[PDB]
């Protein structure tokens, strides 16, 4: 019986002394029986003398040094399956949805090795999203890391919700909203919203699985929430063969949490206070997001800039892993445009002549050139006067403001929220729409009659209704 | 072709688990005892070869 | 030794896994038949065309 | 062949300048050029017409 | 089938172990282990743990030896028996690494069988002596306008590629490998380069895309890829450039010209930082290790063009630095700059503003790169680097009363800027570059308004081939302009410029 007596509790770093020839291994799981049920401590060092050093995932308050510990071995194994869809589970993998024990066939270790060089897929296919704006100006793709920028209240949650809806139609995959140190006020809201928009529905369908982090939970448990989420996703990808989309909250708080755990483990703090083990921790996290031959996870991550410093190492490390950046802005929302996507700030790795298709690339490049010129033209056009527009310039103004409006499309999730039924417009049809607008076929119909229209087909309808 | 390659991998993990099953059988048997004798005489030969 | 035990056991006891064509079919994209001859139909037919062109041929070229 | 056709196309453009009320004839010739180039791009795009079996 | 492969493997385990040295691990974790025993250990040896992980002894202390784990902690457990590999860290080197992705241990991660390797050779080695160096004279052609003449590069030559993060930094190097496709598909062994692309600190997916790109451009057959992805252990990443350079030296020591691109050494710095901090050695300047200069200098100076007496080979080196915030002042960047001869600083503003690649010429220099140059492209391109750093000055104060002298320069400068531009993944013949540069230098691109300069360029090239490919064939063999070629270029350029 691999058992040991607690021989230190300096901070949340609890050293447990085991009786000889029963020594744990690194990344094992120890469970200390407590009136708090259990505390799961994860072995993160061997200090010798048949003593180990572990980190805690739950508060170490009231420990009596010498308490019996039980070694469960290996990384913490969390239940996985379609049983875990729509269940809020805390880091240890226990219901916090309060809907009681989740019966799920298998449980699996939270640390797992990234797929092999061979297992990496040799091409990245554009994942479709009903949002035309996304599919134009920054196409999402398999195994992709898409780093959200902007602030909550622009409709961050709605944007995320929309994506879940889109994913269900598009693929019929799964999602897991993983929230790193999620604000519990927001967490209540998210659960209520997700229930309300039926992406989680009691006996109904549950697509997104929730793992919500909590800032009251120890720094160690902040570090491990991400890994727990990653495992769930991998069960879906590898063992249910489904594409997944995994949201992460602040990866600033991923780093921040990691930094603390390093300091607790006692290591020389690296530059800008960040962990010395900074690179490796992102590396493991962001190399289990890959496109496998079974499925592909895709991750939308949230980057909370640290005091707007883009020079900071934590942003830099993040940007290295990131494949696309979606830069939501509130200015855009103030131009009535929902999507809130700032067109000249969003960029993706995939958005090349061959990569996204030549036609699409050329169309995109033109629309981008059009918008780029429109903004710049508007700088001195607005000031000097609209009468100072050239025939060439006002052609651009006409096209652009019509494109800008044409970007606006309701969201299925936000059918209630805007009041207008969503338009999930396919990738092929997105290209088609912009081609016509480029060819001036459309843009002879009012600006407001492109407002909140879906595809090309939709603004045929709106032209008729506008007239009627 | 893709499934054919997949089937080779699937076979490899199936036969891997059969190897684990064989290990559980081996450590049961008093082949466990008799092969300790085999190790013993081999170790004698090795250590005498030094 | 252990090599022999493992060798003997592994080879001898070797399992057969499913490899049914039916199971395979599920895991592959199924064969599609020919695309059907179809018919190539070419524009400009009927005496609709004849009347139209005779009539059309009246616009003086200035 | 196709080069004859295109010489007549552009010749007809500078002839069509000199004939008003025949301002959409040239658009039909342009359309004929268009579809000629479309089918040519089809023919150049063309897959091998036989199943691979030496690697397949 | 699968059974036969298994049978091959079981047969492929043979013979019982003969060992007579071990240590037993004390405390382990932090990617350092403290081992008890191994008193007969060699310094910087490779040791193998019972976990199967291998490590390099760094600190030999009187009672303990401190291995550094090239691998993951989870594998290792305390009190395991570590037996000495018996060899100082060496990696297989040989011809058969050609066209193989490998990890830094030399395990083929493309898994195209076990590597065929002539030898193994120690990871750290001292760089060739002064007497083993012969000054450079053979160039490497990059097929990129400015690179291949305004910032020319030699063979064996060490010249930096520095610039902004993920400006598709990698692409500049890829183009060199592509340009030398016909050189390396050449039969002249002197013209053959063998290029090693070291991918350090990069996503395994991204590397796989690179591999696929290279194999699409069928370039793999003349190139080796060493891979040290982000996931791979931080000490392994530390040992990754050194190991790659050993492979390069085997080619070099065949007297065969080669190239090695170390993308990105900035990630080696972070790796060494991690290692140093975990070795609890006090942080150096800017919190990067105090021996970081030594780390880079020992790595970098291995690139050489061997003396004629002692072979003739080369191993050209271009190391790719990811400048944080694009500010070249910073300890890690400056340390590299001082080591390298020449820099290829890239400017983000220009990159965004469609110079692909945007070779800033204010912070791009080349010193001994211009001692290996095609004489034709020395004659035509003379002082153009100065002219366009007069264009830089002129436009500095353009943003004012502009003297006609300055205005003329600005007009030329702007037109020249158009000429500079290249289109990514399209490499250009050296011969073809000679007329284009003649035109601009001789100011014939006044004759084409700036917007249509691009049209002129392509048309001019088509013209040149059709009008007389004789000139280009001459520059192909002679490689040095003559009066006849010079006149022919004046005549030809005026002729095309007119039309």
UniProtKB/Swiss-Prot annotation, chain A:
<dbReference type="GO" id="GO:0015986">
    <property type="term" value="P:proton motive force-driven ATP synthesis"/>
</dbReference>
<dbReference type="Pfam" id="PF02874">
    <property type="entry name" value="ATP-synt_ab_N"/>
</dbReference>
<dbReference type="InterPro" id="IPR003593">
    <property type="entry name" value="AAA+_ATPase"/>
</dbReference>
<dbReference type="InterPro" id="IPR020003">
    <property type="entry name" value="ATPase_a/bsu_AS"/>
</dbReference>
<dbReference type="InterPro" id="IPR004100">
    <property type="entry name" value="ATPase_F1/V1/A1_a/bsu_N"/>
</dbReference>
<dbReference type="GO" id="GO:0045259">
    <property type="term" value="C:proton-transporting ATP synthase complex"/>
</dbReference>
<dbReference type="InterPro" id="IPR036121">
    <property type="entry name" value="ATPase_F1/V1/A1_a/bsu_N_sf"/>
</dbReference>
<dbReference type="GO" id="GO:0042776">
    <property type="term" value="P:proton motive force-driven mitochondrial ATP synthesis"/>
</dbReference>
<keyword id="KW-0597">Phosphoprotein</keyword>
<protein>
    <recommendedName>
        <fullName>ATP synthase subunit beta, mitochondrial</fullName>
        <ecNumber>7.1.2.2</ecNumber>
    </recommendedName>
</protein>
<keyword id="KW-0375">Hydrogen ion transport</keyword>
<dbReference type="GO" id="GO:0046961">
    <property type="term" value="F:proton-transporting ATPase activity, rotational mechanism"/>
</dbReference>
Curated annotation (Swiss-Prot), chain B:
<comment type="function">
    <text>Mitochondrial membrane ATP synthase (F(1)F(0) ATP synthase or Complex V) produces ATP from ADP in the presence of a proton gradient across the membrane which is generated by electron transport complexes of the respiratory chain. F-type ATPases consist of two structural domains, F(1) - containing the extramembraneous catalytic core, and F(0) - containing the membrane proton channel, linked together by a central stalk and a peripheral stalk. During catalysis, ATP synthesis in the catalytic domain of F(1) is coupled via a rotary mechanism of the central stalk subunits to proton translocation.</text>
</comment>
<comment type="subunit">
    <text>F-type ATPases have 2 components, CF(1) - the catalytic core - and CF(0) - the membrane proton channel. In yeast, the dimeric form of ATP synthase consists of 17 polypeptides: alpha, beta, gamma, delta, epsilon, 4 (B), 5 (OSCP), 6 (A), 8, 9 (C), d, E (Tim11), f, g, h, i/j and k.</text>
</comment>
<comment type="similarity">
    <text>Belongs to the eukaryotic ATPase B chain family.</text>
</comment>
<protein>
    <recommendedName>
        <fullName>ATP synthase subunit 4, mitochondrial</fullName>
    </recommendedName>
</protein>
UniProtKB/Swiss-Prot annotation, chain D:
<comment type="subunit">
    <text>F-type ATPases have 2 components, CF(1) - the catalytic core - and CF(0) - the membrane proton channel. In yeast, the dimeric form of ATP synthase consists of 17 polypeptides: alpha, beta, gamma, delta, epsilon, 4 (B), 5 (OSCP), 6 (A), 8, 9 (C), d, E (Tim11), f, g, h, i/j and k.</text>
</comment>
<comment type="similarity">
    <text>Belongs to the ATPase d subunit family.</text>
</comment>
<comment type="function">
    <text>Mitochondrial membrane ATP synthase (F(1)F(0) ATP synthase or Complex V) produces ATP from ADP in the presence of a proton gradient across the membrane which is generated by electron transport complexes of the respiratory chain. F-type ATPases consist of two structural domains, F(1) - containing the extramembraneous catalytic core, and F(0) - containing the membrane proton channel, linked together by a central stalk and a peripheral stalk. During catalysis, ATP synthesis in the catalytic domain of F(1) is coupled via a rotary mechanism of the central stalk subunits to proton translocation.</text>
</comment>
<protein>
    <recommendedName>
        <fullName>ATP synthase subunit d, mitochondrial</fullName>
    </recommendedName>
</protein>
Curated annotation (Swiss-Prot), chain E:
<dbReference type="Pfam" id="PF00006">
    <property type="entry name" value="ATP-synt_ab"/>
</dbReference>
<dbReference type="GO" id="GO:0005743">
    <property type="term" value="C:mitochondrial inner membrane"/>
</dbReference>
<comment type="function">
    <text>Mitochondrial membrane ATP synthase (F(1)F(0) ATP synthase or Complex V) produces ATP from ADP in the presence of a proton gradient across the membrane which is generated by electron transport complexes of the respiratory chain. F-type ATPases consist of two structural domains, F(1) - containing the extramembraneous catalytic core, and F(0) - containing the membrane proton channel, linked together by a central stalk and a peripheral stalk. During catalysis, ATP synthesis in the catalytic domain of F(1) is coupled via a rotary mechanism of the central stalk subunits to proton translocation.</text>
</comment>
<dbReference type="InterPro" id="IPR005294">
    <property type="entry name" value="ATP_synth_F1_asu"/>
</dbReference>
<dbReference type="InterPro" id="IPR020003">
    <property type="entry name" value="ATPase_a/bsu_AS"/>
</dbReference>
<dbReference type="InterPro" id="IPR000793">
    <property type="entry name" value="ATP_synth_asu_C"/>
</dbReference>
<feature type="modified residue" description="Phosphoserine">
    <location>
        <position position="135"/>
    </location>
</feature>
<keyword id="KW-0597">Phosphoprotein</keyword>
<keyword id="KW-0809">Transit peptide</keyword>
<keyword id="KW-0375">Hydrogen ion transport</keyword>
<dbReference type="InterPro" id="IPR027417">
    <property type="entry name" value="P-loop_NTPase"/>
</dbReference>
<keyword id="KW-0999">Mitochondrion inner membrane</keyword>
């Amino acid at each position: 019986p691999i058992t040991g007596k607690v021989t230190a509790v300096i901070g949340a770093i609890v050293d447990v002394h085991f009786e000889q020839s029963e020594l744990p291994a690194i990344l094992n799981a120890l469970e200390i029986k407590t009136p708090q049920g259990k505390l799961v401590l994860e072995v993160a060092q061997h200090l010798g003398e048949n003593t180990v050093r572990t980190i805690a995932m739950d508060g170490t308050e009231g420990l009596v040094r010498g308490e019996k510990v039980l070694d469960t071995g290996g990384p913490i194994s969390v239940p996985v399956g379609r049983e875990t869809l729509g269940r809020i589970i805390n880091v240890i993998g226990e219901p916090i949805d309060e809907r009681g024990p989740i019966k799920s066939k298998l449980r699996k270790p939270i640390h797992a090795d990234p797929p092999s060089f061979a297992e990496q897929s040799t091409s990245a296919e554009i994942l479709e999203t009903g949002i035309k704006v996304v599919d134009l100006l920054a196409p999402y793709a398999r195994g992709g890391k898409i780093g959200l920028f902007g602030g909550a209240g622009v409709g961050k949650t709605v944007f995320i919700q929309e994506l879940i809806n889109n994913i269900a139609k598009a693929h019929g995959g799964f999602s897991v909203f993983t929230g790193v140190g999620e604000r519990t006020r927001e967490g209540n809201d998210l659960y209520r919203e997700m229930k309300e928009t039926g992406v989680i529905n009691l006996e109904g369908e549950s697509k997104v699985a929730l793992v919500f982090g909590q800032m009251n939970e120890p720094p160690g448990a902040r570090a491990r929430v991400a890994l727990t989420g990653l495992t769930i996703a991998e069960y879906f990808r590898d063992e249910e063969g489904q594409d997944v989309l995994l949201f992460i909250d602040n990866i600033f708080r991923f780093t921040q949490a990691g930094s603390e755990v390093s300091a607790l483990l006692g290591r020389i703090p690296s530059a800008v206070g960040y962990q010395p083990t900074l690179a490796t921790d992102m590396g493991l996290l962001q190399e289990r997001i890959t496109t496998t031959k079974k499925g592909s996870v895709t991750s939308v991550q949230a980057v909370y800039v640290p005091a707007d410093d883009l020079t900071d190492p934590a942003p830099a490390t993040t940007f290295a892993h990131l494949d696309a950046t979606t830069v939501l802005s509130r200015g855009i929302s103030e131009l009535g445009i929902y999507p809130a996507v700032d067109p000249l700030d969003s960029k993706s790795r995939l958005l090349d002549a061959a990569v996204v298709g030549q036609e699409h690339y050329d169309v995109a490049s033109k629309v981008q050139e059009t918008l780029q010129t429109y903004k710049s033209l508007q700088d001195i056009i607005a000031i000097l006067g609209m009468d100072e527009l050239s025939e060439q310039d006002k052609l651009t103004v006409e096209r652009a403001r019509k494109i800008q409006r044409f970007l606006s499309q309701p969201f299925a999730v936000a059918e209630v929220f805007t009041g207008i039924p969503g338009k999930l417009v396919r990738l092929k049809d997105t290209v088609a729409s912009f081609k016509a607008v480029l060819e001036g076929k459309y843009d002879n119909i009012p600006e407001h009659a492109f407002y909140m229209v879906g595809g090309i087909e939709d603004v045929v309808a709106k032209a008729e209704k506008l007239a009627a | 072709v893709r499934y054919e390659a997949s089937l080779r991998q699937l076979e490899q993990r199936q036969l891997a688990k059969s190897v684990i099953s064989r290990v559980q059988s081996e450590l049961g048997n008093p082949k466990f005892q008799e092969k300790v004798l085999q190790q013993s005489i081999s170790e004698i030969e090795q250590l005498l070869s030094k | 030794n252990v090599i022999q035990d493992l060798y003997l056991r592994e080879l001898k006891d070797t399992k057969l896994a499913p490899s049914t064509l039916q199971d395979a079919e599920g895991n592959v994209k199924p064969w599609n038949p020919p695309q059907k001859p179809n018919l190539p139909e070419l524009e400009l037919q009927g005496p609709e065309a004849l009347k139209a062109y005779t009539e059309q041929n009246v616009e003086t070229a200035h | 062949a196709k080069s004859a056709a295109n010489k007549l196309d552009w010749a007809k453009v500078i002839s069509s300048l000199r004939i008003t009320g025949s301002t959409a004839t040239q658009l039909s010739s342009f359309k004929k050029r268009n579809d000629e180039a479309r089918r040519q791009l089809l023919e150049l795009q063309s897959q091998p017409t036989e199943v691979d079996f030496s690697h397949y | 089938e699968v059974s036969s492969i298994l049978e091959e493997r079981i047969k492929g385990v043979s013979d019982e172990a003969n060992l007579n040295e071990t240590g037993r691990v004390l405390a382990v974790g932090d990617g350092i282990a403290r081992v008890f025993g191994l008193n007969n250990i060699q310094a910087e040896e490779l040791v193998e743990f019972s976990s199967g992980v291998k490590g390099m002894a760094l600190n030999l202390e009187p009672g303990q030896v401190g291995i550094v784990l090239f691998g993951s902690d989870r594998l290792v457990k305390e009190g395991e028996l570590v037996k000495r590999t018996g060899n100082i860290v060496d990696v297989p080197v040989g011809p058969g690494l050609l066209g193989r992705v490998v990890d830094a241990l030399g395990n083929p991660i493309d898994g195209k069988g076990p590597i065929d390797a002539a030898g193994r050779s120690r990871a750290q080695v001292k760089a060739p002596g002064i007497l083993p160096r012969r000054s450079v004279h053979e160039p490497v052609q990059t097929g990129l306008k400015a690179v291949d003449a305004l910032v020319p590069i030699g063979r064996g030559q060490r010249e930096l590629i520095i610039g902004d993060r993920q400006t598709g930094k990698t692409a500049v190097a890829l183009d060199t490998i592509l340009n030398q496709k016909r050189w390396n598909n050449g039969s002249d062994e002197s013209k053959k380069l063998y290029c090693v692309y070291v991918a350090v600190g990069q996503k395994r997916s991204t590397v796989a895309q690179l591999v696929q790109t290279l194999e699409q451009h069928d370039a793999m057959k003349y190139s080796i890829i060493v891979a040290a992805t982000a996931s791979e252990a931080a000490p392994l990443q530390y040992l990754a450039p050194f190991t790659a350079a050993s492979i390069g030296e085997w080619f070099r020591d065949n007297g065969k010209h080669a190239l090695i691109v170390y993308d990105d050494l900035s990630k080696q710095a972070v790796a060494y930082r991690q290692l140093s901090l975990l070795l609890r050695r006090p942080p150096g300047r800017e919190a990067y290790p105090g021996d970081v200069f030594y780390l880079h200098s020992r790595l970098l100076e291995r690139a050489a063009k061997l003396s004629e007496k002692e072979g003739s080979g080369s191993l050209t080196a271009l190391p790719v630095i990811e400048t944080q915030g694009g500010d070249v002042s910073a300890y890690i960047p400056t340390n590299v700059i001082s080591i390298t001869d020449g820099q290829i600083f890239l400017e983000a503003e220009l990159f965004y503003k469609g110079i692909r690649p945007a070779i800033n010429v204010g912070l791009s220099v080349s010193r001994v790169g211009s001692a290996a140059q095609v004489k034709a492209l020395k004659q035509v391109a003379g002082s153009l680097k100065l002219f366009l750093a007069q264009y830089r000055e002129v436009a500095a104060f353009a943003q004012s009363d502009l003297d006609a002298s300055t205005k003329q320069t600005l007009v030329r400068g702007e037109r020249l800027t158009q000429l500079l531009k290249q289109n990514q993944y399209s490499p250009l013949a050296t011969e073809e570059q000679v007329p284009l540069i003649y035109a601009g230098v001789n100011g014939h691109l006044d004759g084409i308004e700036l917007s249509r300069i691009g049209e002129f360029e392509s048309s001019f090239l088509s013209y040149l081939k059709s009008n007389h490919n004789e000139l280009l064939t001459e520059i192909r063999e002679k490689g040095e302009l003559s009066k006849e070629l010079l006149a022919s270029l004046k005549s030809a350029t005026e002729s095309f410029v007119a039309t």
